[PDB]
Amino acid sequence: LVPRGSHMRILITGGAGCLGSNLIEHWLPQGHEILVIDNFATGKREVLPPVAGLSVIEGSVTDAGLLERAFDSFKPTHVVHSAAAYKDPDDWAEDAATNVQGSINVAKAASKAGVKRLLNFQTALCYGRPATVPIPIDSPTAPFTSYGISKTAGEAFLMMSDVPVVSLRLANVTGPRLAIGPIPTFYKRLKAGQKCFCSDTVRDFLDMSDFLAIADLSLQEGRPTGVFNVSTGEGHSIKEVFDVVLDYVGATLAEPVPVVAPGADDVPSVVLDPSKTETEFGWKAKVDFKDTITGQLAWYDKYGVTDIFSHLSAPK
Amino acid sequence: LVPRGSHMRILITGGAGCLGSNLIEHWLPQGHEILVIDNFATGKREVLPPVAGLSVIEGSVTDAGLLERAFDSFKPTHVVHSAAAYKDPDDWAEDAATNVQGSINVAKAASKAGVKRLLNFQTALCYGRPATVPIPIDSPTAPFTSYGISKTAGEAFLMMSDVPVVSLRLANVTGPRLAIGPIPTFYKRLKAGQKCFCSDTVRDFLDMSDFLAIADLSLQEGRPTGVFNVSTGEGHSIKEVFDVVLDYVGATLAEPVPVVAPGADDVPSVVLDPSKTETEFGWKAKVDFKDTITGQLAWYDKYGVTDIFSHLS
Ligand SMILES: NC(=O)c1ccc[n+]([C@@H]2O[C@H](COP(=O)([O-])OP(=O)(O)OC[C@H]3O[C@@H](n4cnc5c(N)ncnc54)[C@H](O)[C@@H]3O)[C@@H](O)[C@H]2O)c1
Ligand SMILES: NC(=O)c1ccc[n+]([C@@H]2O[C@H](COP(=O)([O-])OP(=O)(O)OC[C@H]3O[C@@H](n4cnc5c(N)ncnc54)[C@H](O)[C@@H]3O)[C@@H](O)[C@H]2O)c1
Ligand SMILES: O=c1ccn([C@@H]2O[C@H](COP(=O)(O)OP(=O)(O)O)[C@@H](O)[C@H]2O)c(=O)[nH]1
Secondary structure, three states: OOOOOOOOEEEEEOOOOHHHHHHHHHHHHHOOEEEEEEOOOOOOHHHOOOOOOEEEEEOOOOOHHHHHHHHHHHOOOEEEEOOOOOOOOOOHHHHHHHHHHHHHHHHHHHHHHOOOEEEEEEEHHHHOOOOOOOEOOOOOOOOOOHHHHHHHHHHHHHHOOOOOEEEEEEOEEEOOOOOOOHHHHHHHHHHOOOOOOEEOOEEOEEEHHHHHHHHHHHOOOOOOOEEEEEOOOOOEEHHHHHHHHHHHHOOOOOOOOOEEOOOOOOOOEEOEOOHHHHHHHOOOOOOOHHHHHHHHHHHHHHHOOOOOOOOOOOOO | OOOOOOOOEEEEEOOOOHHHHHHHHHHHHHOOEEEEEEOOOOOOHHHOOOOOOEEEEEOOOOOHHHHHHHHHHHOOOEEEEOOOOOOOOOOHHHHHHHHHHHHHHHHHHHHHOOOOEEEEEEOHHHHOOOOOOOEOOOOOOOOOOHHHHHHHHHHHHHHOOOOOEEEEEEOEEEOOOOOOOHHHHHHHHHHOOOOOOEEOOEEOEEEHHHHHHHHHHHOOOOOOOEEEEEOOOOOEEHHHHHHHHHHHHOOOOOOOOOEEOOOOOOOOEEOEOOHHHHHHHOOOOOOOHHHHHHHHHHHHHHHOOOOOOOOOO
């Protein structure tokens, strides 16, 4: 079993999604054994080819018996909890079941199984309308949407675990198979010459490579535990994203792009302060904004705007 | 249809509990119709006698089918959501099912049924360890126990409802059938000549009469909605509570009462600032600390330390 002396058996809930599939493509070539649990609510079957070292259970983190059996059999050394429901903002029941009860079941199962470390991903919706930007890690949680409320409580339950837990509050991560948001929107619209708009909002953006680096650190024995902000700590407007994409695809506009006031629930600025993560993990994001966006675009050049292109080579 | 029409059809989840039963004893003599839904996890079957105007469904807020059936037939005008799980701090799944999923199910059912107003009760555990005490209503929520975390999310879901919602963050309410906590413990043990202890913590206490007053205003058409602290705004140590019980019962101690450090998960001081509640509702608590404690003891004097004595005939 390899990496010699550092071989992991990783159980990844939500492993068929964006971050989950990128983590598999990162870890599987290293010889780690991976078990995915996913219900394919938003994740895709085609990112999980029948390949060596990779096992898949189709099912839900809401199903505590299923998890018990999975943990019982697979005996994971490490857990990455990447499953989340969000696609229907009115389906509060689903959000609470997946994000709260799913987090509880994973924490309970991981404790019984003697998991070494659990890694959870948290949305910046946990902060609600922030008192200040960039957002300090000691900011209160103050969510006001179903996705935010349920994810805040799931994280909070995971923090009560006797399992060492790292919960990463994430900037917007970019990389293979990201097929939603302003980046692919501006890409498909500008190339097609369709009409675009930008919310007058500010966000942070993180290259996949820097995400993989902190994920790696979070799973190492005796590293820090708790909640951490993962970002460059720099905010850029949606308009700035747009200007990068427009220059990249080499289009000229007929009229100025509208930059419009955000809707009532669209938080104007959400940028995370990473300083404590830099202090405690020794980690710093290496990829600037322009390289992050253009890196996303270069992937699109190569594969299309698709969440189903796998970098793994079947059959086994 | 009395009182005339401010007659309410009130669906009260958790109706067999301390607050729910006191609310029933307060509203039923006025002529309101009440439906209770309770699974009896902590509430008692004995406090809901088969009396005109009161009906009971044994079930869970976690059962959406049951709730849809209850809402469809009873057709309530008002909901009081008083169901909560907490008795096992390690049963995170149950606190989440009852306090989060139960709150969602009740909101969704109340919206579908076009309920006029919904009242929710919130634990001060929602504030976790506060930066300022007394605790302002705009203080963040920062729970770190199962009960606090699940109750914080349940409340935040209810606030997303299109039904007008009032969620009251409460002081420690005293009154009929409160059979837990420092007050009955000191009462029983001091009378038995048994040794006690006080935790070195500060808390606020609210007489049932004041709780009843704000519950009334919360249900009135056109009144404020949102979250509100319900308290006198004054804090008192558990030792002060002790001294009140010791004086009341007439006992004399053989040793001074040991005062013990707060447990790891106990917040040293939890006292709520009700100013905004005063401003928006025109409500102020009337019964002071000593009268609040002594009125609880006078109840035990009459009925014993019991959660089953009903004032309904
Ligand atoms: N991508 C980001 O920049 C970002 C930012 C902040 C937080 N996060 C968090 O990271 C995690 C992954 O995000 P993503 O971008 O990969 O989203 P995603 O939708 O691609 O991945 C979520 C995965 O969870 C699965 N899932 C949903 N409900 C489930 C359930 N009941 N049981 C098992 N699986 C279930 C989905 O099918 C999907 O495969 C989520 O927890 C999310 O909240 C992501
Ligand atoms: N009494 C107080 O001083 C105090 C203080 C702060 C907040 N609160 C809140 O007020 C409400 C009532 O508190 P209480 O002191 O009456 O507690 P209680 O335990 O006496 O009443 C709660 C009732 O809910 C019932 N219940 C539990 N799970 C249920 C479920 N799944 N479905 C239906 N019923 C269920 C219990 O059986 C009980 O009768 C709770 O929401 C509590 O968090 C009370
Ligand atoms: O065509 C688009 C699509 C997205 N956005 C904006 O881009 C930001 C980030 O996108 P996302 O969909 O992730 O929404 P968020 O959860 O950050 O509010 C939001 O403020 C959106 O309003 C935009 O301006 N134009």
